[PDB]
C-alpha cells in the first residue's frame, strides 16, 4: 500500500509516504526512481 | 547493443554463434578461420559477427544492481 | 548489402529501395527517447503545488480513461503505454493570485503516437521544490 | 655511474627473466587499484600476474589455450597484460619480443 | 529430379526440364508462402533488464519454434486469447542472483553470477487443453537451444508469456522457414581448341 | 530510325515527341504517353539490369601510355616559357604584360 521509491545509488527501498525532503534512508543520495508497474503490458512481436 | 538473432540479409540464425566466436578467438584463430569453423559461408552472415560491438557487456556496469 | 542497379523506377532521384525482410529482422531499427518534466514549488506564502491521486469512476471502481496510467501517487508508472490526451502528472496549483482552493494543471502527453514510460526520476532542490522527470520511449 | 653497488637498488624494482629485465609487480599496482579497462570491473590480484611471469621463468613460454580458467580471472585481463610484453603467434600464445641475450 | 546432397537442415537437388517461370515459383513459395509457427504476442510481467521491452519482443519473435505447422489452424481476426487448435504458449522466467561462493579475484561474470545470460533453453512450453497428450515431451521446443536473448546482472528479472501462432512469410519475415532458398543454372564450360603445354 | 535521347524525350528543348503530341493532338495525348513511358521503361530496365562499377572508370593500358606522353610534353613546353620569361625573350602577346 505505501509508495516505495528505489534509490539511485544503492537500489534500496525507501517508502517515502511522508512529506519529507527527498533523501535516501541508508545513504546520502537524493535521487529516487519509481518502481515498475504491476499491470501487464502486451507487445506485438514484430 | 546485443547480437542480432538473425542475419538481416538472409535470415540465418547467427545469434547463437557469438559466445562461440569469442571463445575461438581465445584459442588464437584468425577471424577468417573462426567464421569458417562456425559455418558462415556467405559474407552477409560473416559481417554480423565481424562488425558487431558488444555494447551490453559495457552498459551493464553502469546499470543498477543490489 | 548494396546492389547498385536500377530497380522498379521508384528510385529516380536519390530514392533507395529497401528490403522488407531486412527491416523485419532489424535493419534500421531505432529508438526515440523524449523527456517530460514537472516542477512542484513552495511559494512565498506557505502554500504548495500538489499531486492528487487518480480520479476514480465511482460507478466502476477504475480510474477514468484520461487517468488510466496514473499510479497512486498521481505520477505515471514505468512500463505502461501512454496515449494522446492522457495525464502523466496530476499537478494542481493554488490560485492565490481562507482555506486553499486549487486549479488543476495536469502535464499531458501530446503526441500523435503512443509512447512507453521507461523511468520516473524524483529529486528535490534546496528550496523544497520537487523535481520530476519522465523518460519516454518509442 | 657506480655500476656495481646499484644492483641492490635495481633488485627492488626489476628482476631478470629470460635474459632480460621484467618490471616488478609493486611498481604497477598496489593492492587497492580499480580496473584499468572497460567491460566488467575486476579487483587487483598481483599473484595473478606473478604466476604468469613465473611460468615464463620455468617453461619456454605460456603455451596453452585456457590458462584464464586455471587462474579464474578475465581473459580481458590476461590478454591485455601480456600485450605489453609480447606479440601473438597462431595458437601458441605469445612471442617474447626480444632475443635471448 | 536428382538429389545430390541432403543432411540435417540442408538439401541440394537438380530439376531438369522445368522452366524458369515455374522454378522461380517454387523459390518464391518457400520464401513467402509456406507457413510456420512464430511468436506474435508477448505478455510482460516485471521486465527489469536493460533490454527494452519492444526490443525483447522483437528478438523473441525471430526464434524458430519446432512446432509442425500443419497441425494448427490460422487464428481468426480478433480473438486475442486463442485456443488449443491454433496457438502454443511459452513461459520465460529468469531471476539473476549472486553466486554465494566466489574466489577473491572475482574477475569474471561466469563465476560471480548465476543466470546472468538468458538463453532460449529457459523457454518452458505451457500446454493448452489436450496438447500435452498429442505432443510427446520435447517436441514443442525452440530449435537451437543456444540463442542469447537478454543478458542480466543481479537483482534483475524477466518474466513473460509468449503466444505462437501460424502465419506465412509474405506477412512478416519471422515466418519464413528457409535460411536461403535459391537456384542456379548449371554451367557447361567447353573448350573450343585443345589447351596443352603450360 | 534513331534512338531516343534527352533531346527527343527530355525537358531540354523542342523537337520532343511529347511536345509534338501537345501541339498537334492535344494535352490529353501528351499526358497519356508520359504515363505510359513512366510505366513501361522501369519494366524493361529492371529486367535488363543496369549497373556501374569500379571497372567502368578504370583506365586501360591504352590511356596510361598516352597520359604519360601528354604530361611530359606539356610540362616541358611550360618549362621553356618559364625560362623565356625569367632569362630571355618571351613573345609578349598584344594587350597584356609579359607575366
Ligand atoms: Zn541511497
Ligand atoms: Zn546472411
Swiss-Prot record, chain A:
One cellular component GO annotation, for this chain's record? nucleoplasm
Q: What is its main location?
A: nucleus
Picking any one GO molecular function of the record gives: DNA binding
On whether Cell inner membrane is a keyword of this UniProt record, the answer is no
Q: Where are the zinc fingers (C4-type)?
A: 7-27
* Binding partners and assembly: Component of the RNA polymerase I (Pol I), RNA polymerase II (Pol II) and RNA polymerase III (Pol III) complexes consisting of at least 13, 12 and 17 subunits, respectively. Pol I complex consists of a ten-subunit catalytic core composed of POLR1A/RPA1, POLR1B/RPA2, POLR1C/RPAC1, POLR1D/RPAC2, POLR1H/RPA12, POLR2E/RPABC1, POLR2F/RPABC2, POLR2H/RPABC3, POLR2K/RPABC4 and POLR2L/RPABC5; a mobile stalk subunit POLR1F/RPA43 protruding from the core and additional subunits homologous to general transcription factors POLR1E/RPA49 and POLR1G/RPA34.
Function, as annotated: DNA-dependent RNA polymerase catalyzes the transcription of DNA into RNA using the four ribonucleoside triphosphates as substrates. Common component of RNA polymerases I, II and III which synthesize ribosomal RNA precursors, mRNA precursors and many functional non-coding RNAs, and a small RNAs, such as 5S rRNA and tRNAs, respectively.
Q: Which family does it belong to?
A: Belongs to the archaeal Rpo12/eukaryotic RPC10 RNA polymerase subunit family.
Protein name as annotated: DNA-directed RNA polymerases I, II, and III subunit RPABC4
Q: Which organism is it from?
A: Homo sapiens (Human)
- Encoding gene (name): POLR2K
Which residues of the parent protein does this chain contain? 13 to 58 of 58
UniProtKB/Swiss-Prot annotation, chain C:
Q: Where is the signal peptide?
A: none
Q: Which disease is it linked to?
A: Leukodystrophy, hypomyelinating, 8, with or without oligodontia and/or hypogonadotropic hypogonadism: An autosomal recessive neurodegenerative disorder characterized by early childhood onset of cerebellar ataxia and mild intellectual disabilities associated with diffuse hypomyelination apparent on brain MRI. Variable features include oligodontia and/or hypogonadotropic hypogonadism. Charcot-Marie-Tooth disease, demyelinating, type 1I: An autosomal dominant demyelinating form of Charcot-Marie-Tooth disease, a disorder of the peripheral nervous system, characterized by progressive weakness and atrophy, initially of the peroneal muscles and later of the distal muscles of the arms. Charcot-Marie-Tooth disease is classified in two main groups on the basis of electrophysiologic properties and histopathology: primary peripheral demyelinating neuropathies (designated CMT1 when they are dominantly inherited) and primary peripheral axonal neuropathies (CMT2).
**Residues bound to Mg(2+):** 14
What is this protein's gene name?
POLR3B
Query: Which subcellular locations apply to this protein?
Result: Nucleus; Cytoplasm, Cytosol
Question: Could you tell me which species this protein originates from?
Answer: Homo sapiens (Human)
The protein depicted here goes by the name DNA-directed RNA polymerase III subunit RPC2
Top-level division of the source organism's lineage: Eukaryota
Family statement: Belongs to the RNA polymerase beta chain family.
Curated annotation (Swiss-Prot), chain D:
Per UniProt, subcellular location reads as:
Nucleus
Highest taxon of the source?
Eukaryota
Q: Which cysteines are joined by disulfide bonds?
A: none
Q: Its quaternary structure?
A: Component of the RNA polymerase III complex consisting of at least 17 subunits: a ten-subunit horseshoe-shaped catalytic core composed of POLR3A/RPC1, POLR3B/RPC2, POLR1C/RPAC1, POLR1D/RPAC2, POLR3K/RPC10, POLR2E/RPABC1, POLR2F/RPABC2, POLR2H/RPABC3, POLR2K/RPABC4 and POLR2L/RPABC5; the stalk composed of two subunits POLR3H/RPC8 and CRCP/RPC9, forming a structural mobile part that protrudes out of the core and functions primarily in transcription initiation; and additional subunits homologous to general transcription factors of the RNA polymerase II machinery, POLR3D/RPC4-POLR3E/RPC5 heterodimer and POLR3/CRPC3-POLR3F/RPC6-POLR3G/RPC7 heterotrimer.
Query: What role does this protein play?
Result: DNA-dependent RNA polymerase catalyzes the transcription of DNA into RNA using the four ribonucleoside triphosphates as substrates. Specific peripheric component of RNA polymerase III (Pol III) which synthesizes small non-coding RNAs including 5S rRNA, snRNAs, tRNAs and miRNAs from at least 500 distinct genomic loci. Assembles with POLR3D/RPC4 forming a subcomplex that binds the Pol III core. Enables recruitment of Pol III at transcription initiation site and drives transcription initiation from both type 2 and type 3 DNA promoters.
Swiss-Prot record, chain F:
Location in the cell reads: Nucleus; Cytoplasm, Cytosol
Provide the free-text tissue specificity comment from this protein's UniProt record. Answer: Expressed in the brain, in the cortex and the white matter (at protein level).
Kindly list the residue ranges recorded as spanning the membrane: none
Q: Write down the superkingdom of origin.
A: Eukaryota
Disease the record associates with this protein: Leukodystrophy, hypomyelinating, 7, with or without oligodontia and/or hypogonadotropic hypogonadism: An autosomal recessive neurodegenerative disorder characterized by childhood onset of progressive motor decline manifest as spasticity, ataxia, tremor, and cerebellar signs, as well as mild cognitive regression. Other features may include hypodontia or oligodontia and hypogonadotropic hypogonadism. There is considerable inter- and intrafamilial variability. Wiedemann-Rautenstrauch syndrome: An autosomal recessive, neonatal progeroid disorder characterized by intrauterine growth retardation, failure to thrive, short stature, hypotonia, variable mental impairment, and a progeroid appearance. Clinical features include apparent macrocephaly, sparse hair, prominent scalp veins, entropion, greatly widened anterior fontanelles, malar hypoplasia, and generalized lipoatrophy. Death usually occurs in early childhood but survival to third decade has been reported.
Give the record's family classification: Belongs to the RNA polymerase beta' chain family.
What's this protein's name?
DNA-directed RNA polymerase III subunit RPC1
Organism annotation: Homo sapiens
- Lineage of the native species? Eukaryota, Metazoa, Chordata, Craniata, Vertebrata
Amino acid at each position: 500500500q505505501p509508495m516505495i521509491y528505489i534509490c539511485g545509488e544503492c537500489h534500496t527501498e525507501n517508502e517515502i509516504k511522508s512529506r519529507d525532503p527527498i533523501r535516501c534512508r541508508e545513504c546520502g543520495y537524493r535521487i529516487m526512481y519509481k518502481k515498475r508497474t504491476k499491470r501487464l503490458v502486451v507487445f506485438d512481436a514484430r | 547493443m546485443i547480437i542480432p538473432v538473425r542475419c538481416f540479409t538472409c535470415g540465418k540464425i547467427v545469434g547463437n554463434k557469438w559466445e562461440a566466436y569469442l571463445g575461438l578467438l581465445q584459442a588464437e584463430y584468425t577471424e577468417g578461420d573462426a567464421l569458417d569453423a562456425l559455418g558462415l559461408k556467405r559474407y552477409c552472415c560473416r559481417r554480423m559477427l565481424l562488425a558487431h560491438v558488444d555494447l551490453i557487456e559495457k552498459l551493464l556496469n553502469y546499470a543498477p544492481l543490489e | 548489402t548494396v546492389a547498385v542497379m536500377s530497380y522498379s523506377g521508384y528510385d529516380i532521384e536519390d530514392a533507395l529501395v529497401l528490403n522488407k525482410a531486412s527491416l523485419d529482422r532489424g535493419f534500421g531499427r531505432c529508438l526515440v527517447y523524449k523527456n517530460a518534466k514537472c516542477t512542484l514549488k513552495r511559494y512565498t506564502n506557505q502554500t504548495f503545488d500538489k499531486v492528487m491521486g487518480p480520479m476514480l469512476d465511482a460507478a466502476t471502481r477504475k480510474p477514468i480513461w484520461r487517468h488510466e496510467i496514473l499510479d497512486a501517487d498521481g505520477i505515471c508508472s514505468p512500463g505502461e503505454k501512454v496515449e494522446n490526451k492522457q495525464v502523466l502528472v496530476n499537478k494542481s496549483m493554488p490560485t492565490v493570485t481562507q482555506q486553499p482552493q486549487y486549479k488543476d494543471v495536469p502535464i499531458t502527453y501530446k503526441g500523435a503516437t503512443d509512447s512507453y514510460i521507461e523511468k520516473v526520476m524524483i529529486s528535490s532542490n534546496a528550496e523544497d521544490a520537487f523535481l520530476i522527470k519522465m523518460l519516454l520511449r518509442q | 655511474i657506480d655500476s656495481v653497488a646499484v644492483l641492490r637498488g635495481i633488485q627492488k624494482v626489476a628482476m631478470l627473466v629470460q635474459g632480460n629485465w621484467v618490471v616488478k609487480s609493486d611498481i604497477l599496482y598496489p593492492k587497492d587499484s580499480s580496473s584499468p579497462h572497460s567491460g566488467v570491473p575486476a579487483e587487483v590480484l598481483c599473484r595473478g600476474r606473478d604466476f604468469v611471469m613465473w611460468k615464463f621463468t620455468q617453461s619456454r613460454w605460456v603455451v596453452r589455450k585456457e590458462v584464464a580458467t586455471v587462474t579464474k580471472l578475465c581473459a580481458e585481463d590476461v590478454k591485455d597484460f601480456l600485450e605489453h610484453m609480447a606479440v601473438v603467434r597462431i595458437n601458441k600464445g605469445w612471442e617474447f619480443i626480444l632475443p635471448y641475450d | 529430379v536428382d538429389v545430390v546432397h541432403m543432411d540435417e537442415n540442408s538439401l541440394e537437388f537438380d530439376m531438369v526440364g522445368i522452366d524458369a517461370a515455374i522454378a522461380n515459383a517454387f523459390r518464391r513459395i518457400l520464401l513467402a508462402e509456406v507457413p510456420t509457427m512464430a511468436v506474435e504476442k508477448v505478455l510482460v510481467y516485471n521486465n527489469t533488464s536493460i533490454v527494452q521491452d519492444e526490443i525483447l519482443a522483437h528478438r523473441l519473435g525471430l526464434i524458430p519454434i519446432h512446432a509442425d505447422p500443419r497441425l494448427f489452424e490460422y487464428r481468426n481476426q480478433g480473438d486475442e486469447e486463442g485456443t488449443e487448435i491454433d496457438t502454443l504458449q511459452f513461459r520465460l522466467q529468469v531471476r539473476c542472483t549472486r553466486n554465494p561462493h566466489a574466489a577473491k579475484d572475482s574477475s569474471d561474470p561466469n563465476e560471480l553470477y548465476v543466470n546472468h545470460k538468458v538463453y532460449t533453453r529457459h523457454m518452458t512450453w505451457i500446454p493448452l487443453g489436450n496438447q500435452a497428450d498429442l505432443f510427446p515431451e520435447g517436441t514443442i521446443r525452440p530449435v537451437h537451444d543456444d540463442i542469447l536473448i537478454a543478458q542480466l546482472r543481479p537483482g534483475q528479472e524477466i518474466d513473460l508469456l509468449m503466444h505462437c501462432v501460424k502465419g506465412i512469410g509474405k506477412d512478416h519475415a519471422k515466418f519464413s522457414p528457409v535460411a536461403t532458398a535459391s537456384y542456379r543454372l548449371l554451367p557447361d564450360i567447353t573448350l573450343l581448341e585443345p589447351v596443352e603445354g603450360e | 530510325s534513331g534512338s531516343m535521347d534527352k533531346g527527343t524525350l527530355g525537358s531540354g528543348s523542342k523537337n520532343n515527341i511529347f511536345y509534338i503530341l501537345l501541339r498537334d493532338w492535344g494535352q490529353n495525348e501528351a499526358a497519356d504517353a508520359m504515363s505510359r513511358l513512366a510505366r513501361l521503361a522501369p519494366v524493361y530496365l529492371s529486367n535488363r539490369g543496369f549497373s556501374i562499377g569500379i571497372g567502368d572508370v578504370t583506365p586501360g593500358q591504352g590511356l596510361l601510355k598516352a597520359k604519360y606522353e601528354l604530361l611530359n610534353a606539356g610540362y616541358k613546353k611550360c618549362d621553356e616559357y618559364i625560362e623565356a620569361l625569367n632569362t630571355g625573350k618571351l613573345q609578349q602577346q598584344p594587350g597584356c604584360t609579359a607575366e
